[PDB]
A paper describes a structure:
[name] expresses glycerol phosphate wall teichoic acid (WTA), but some health care–associated methicillin-resistant [name] (HA-MRSE) clones produce a second, ribitol phosphate (RboP) WTA, resembling that of the aggressive pathogen Staphylococcus aureus. We report here that the [name] enzyme of HA-MRSE [[name](Se)] glycosylates RboP-WTA with glucose, instead of N-acetylglucosamine (GlcNAc) by [name](Sa) in S. aureus. Each blade of the homotrimer contains a catalytic domain with a canonical GT-B fold, consisting of an N-terminal acceptor substrate-binding domain (ABD; residues 1 to 68 and 202 to 302) and a C-terminal nucleotide-binding domain (residues 303 to 492). [name](Se) is a retaining WTA glycosyltransferase; therefore, the relative positions of donor and acceptor substrates in [name](Se) and TarP are different.
The ribitol moiety of RboP1 forms three hydrogen bonds with the side chains of Asn9 and Gln265, as well as the backbone carbonyl group of Gly229. Three main-chain amide groups interact with the phosphate group of RboP2. Two of these are from tandem backbone amide groups of Gly229 and Ser230, and the third one is contributed by Asn9; this phosphate group is also hydrogen-bonded to the side chain of Ser230. The ribitol moiety of RboP2 has only contact with the side chain and backbone amide group of Glu10. The phosphate group of RboP3 interacts with tandem backbone amide groups of Met18 and Thr19 and is further hydrogen-bonded to the Thr19 side chain. We could not find any electron density for the ribitol moiety of RboP3, the entire RboP4 unit, and the linker region of the molecule. The interactions between RboP1 and [name](Se)G117R are all conserved as in the binary structure.
Numbering used by the authors: 1 to 492
The structure:
């Protein structure tokens, strides 16, 4: 049967967006006898520890594997030697051979050659990590990295101490990879593979070659590009039999813009749409605006699997409005404090709870101070247990000006809760049924959002009845077996 290779630049912990969605997608795929392997392109010396924590935290599937061009070309370079080459290590043992070791503490140390009458290098020693910074006239020109007893990587610097080149070593202590890095532009340039004895113009070229070397061109092996900046590496491949679909996650338009502009990264993925086997997106509304901005015929509509099956008995009848989302501009919290100003104007017993951490903490604190809704509108901060404090809220307001699918609300609905959400660009219009499960209010209409939010708070039954429909509405639209069937229809 057919095997999948999802694509993104990096994978780590504390990443809860694209990564979570890609990793969730893999789980369902394996259950439908299709492999959901990930492809990354960055160098992590400890990439093995990061992958094990994700599996242990039940965020990654044991069956999901990760392909990386540092791991791949190391395992191939490892084959061409038998013994460990301590050449680099001894070259360093030879640079510091006759130098005084000034141990500043248990971690920091400096080497001084009496004959050279100048400090030669610095040593930072920690648990399983030892770094060497080498100098010439008190100017850093090199950095030697050690991890698990062996040299893993060396970094070369210039006069301005800016990174000019990186070198990657295999498990037999040999140079298998190295690249040029533009000093000021901090951009990856001329990449040189050693075991292939090949030269790549940029990282994009190298990674295309890495995909050609990893994914065997065949009708079965399908490539799903999820990372927007990862697409050039997938568009410029030599595969002729391997299928390639792109997925637009967030809203494609340039955020908080009225000029009809589209984010550069996401603009390029849609202009080369023809070259791909199809450009898939979460909402049907985006399939229209995409056939408007790019007149595409390959655009498909498949939603990101909903991993929420929460069933509970809501009895907490308290006048409280909840908004669990990061404090990013796209959430438009300033509208939420306008809605709160009109809500607390009629009913002074209505409390506003905002949960999350981000770039607008001081913006909201000065906004809450204005109008003096201090005890009413409060910030609860980051919380692991979202469901528990959500179960307590009477209703969930979304003042977000743009969104991908409205995951924040799709979750509040699954927690049988009413939702007064602003009609968003590819947002609530897809699930929020005005009067049936919530209140889709036209954007920038505080007054319309306020009176409706008050109506939910002033009707213990209506709010519970609307919310009861909410969970059933989401379960009905977003069905795994048919979502998987939509995926299968693209693969077949
Ligand atoms: O041209 P290159 O030199 O090869 O590299 C420059 C390139 O333009 C960058 O690598 C891209 O910004 C990164 O590409 P991606 O968009 O595929 O990276 C994914 C992104 O970093 C994303 O934020 C990540 O998956 C984790 O997100 P989350 O924490 O929301 O789940």
């Amino acid at each position: 049967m057919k095997q999948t290779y999802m694509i993104v630049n990096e994978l780590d912990v504390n990443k809860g967006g694209m990564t979570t969605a890609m990793l969730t997608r893999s789980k369902f795929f394996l259950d439908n006898e299709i492999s959901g392997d990930i492809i990354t392109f960055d160098f992590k010396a400890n990439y093995k520890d990061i992958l094990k924590e994700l599996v242990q935290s039940k965020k990654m599937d044991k069956r999901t594997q990760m392909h990386n061009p540092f791991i791949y070309f190391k395992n191939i370079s490892n084959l061409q030697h038998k013994k460990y080459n301590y050449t680099m290590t001894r070259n360093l043992s030879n640079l510091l051979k006759d130098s005084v070791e000034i141990k500043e503490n248990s971690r920091i140390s400096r080497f001084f050659n009496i004959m050279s009458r100048e400090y030669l290098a610095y040593k930072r020693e920690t648990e399983q990590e030892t770094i060497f910074d080498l100098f010439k006239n008190n100017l850093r020109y090199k950095r030697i990295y050690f991890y698990k007893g062996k040299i893993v990587k060396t970094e070369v610097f210039n006069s301005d101490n800016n990174l000019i080149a990186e070198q990657f070593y295999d498990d037999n202590g040999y140079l298998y990879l190295y690249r040029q890095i533009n000093p000021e532009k901090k951009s990856i340039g001329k990449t040189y593979l050693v075991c292939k004895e090949k030269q790549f113009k940029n990282n994009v070229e190298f990674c295309s070659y890495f995909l050609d070397k990893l994914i065997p061109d065949i009708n079965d092996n399908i490539i799903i590009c999820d990372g927007p900046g990862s697409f050039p590496k997938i568009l410029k491949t030599n595969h002729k039999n391997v299928k390639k679909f792109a997925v637009i996650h967030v809203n494609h338009y340039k955020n908080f813009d009225d000029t009809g502009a589209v984010k550069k990264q996401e603009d390029y993925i849609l202009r080369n749409a023809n070259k791909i086997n199809g450009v898939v997106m979460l909402t049907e509304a985006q399939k229209k605006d995409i056939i408007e901005k790019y007149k595409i015929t390959n655009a498909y509509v498949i939603s990101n699997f909903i991993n929420i099956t929460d069933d509970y008995r809501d009895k907490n009848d308290n006048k409280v409005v909840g908004h669990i989302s990061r404090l990013v501009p796209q959430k438009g919290l300033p509208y939420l404090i306008d809605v709160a100003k009109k809500v607390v104007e009629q009913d002074n017993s209505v409390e506003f709870h905002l949960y999350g951490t981000g770039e607008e903490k001081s913006k909201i604190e000065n906004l809450i101070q204005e109008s003096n809704l201090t005890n009413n509108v409060k910030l609860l901060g980051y919380t692991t247990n979202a469901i528990e404090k959500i179960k307590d809220f009477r209703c969930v307001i979304s003042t977000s000006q743009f969104e991908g699918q409205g995951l924040s609300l799709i979750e509040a609905m699954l927690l049988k809760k009413p939702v007064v959400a602003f009609d968003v660009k590819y947002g609530p219009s897809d699930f929020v049924k005005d009067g049936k499960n919530g209140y889709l209010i036209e954007n920038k209409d505080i007054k319309k959002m306020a009176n409706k939010i008050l109506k939910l708070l002033h009707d213990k039954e209506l709010s519970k009845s609307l919310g009861k429909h909410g969970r059933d509405t989401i379960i009905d639209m977003y069905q795994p077996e048919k979502l998987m069937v939509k995926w299968k229809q693209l693969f077949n």
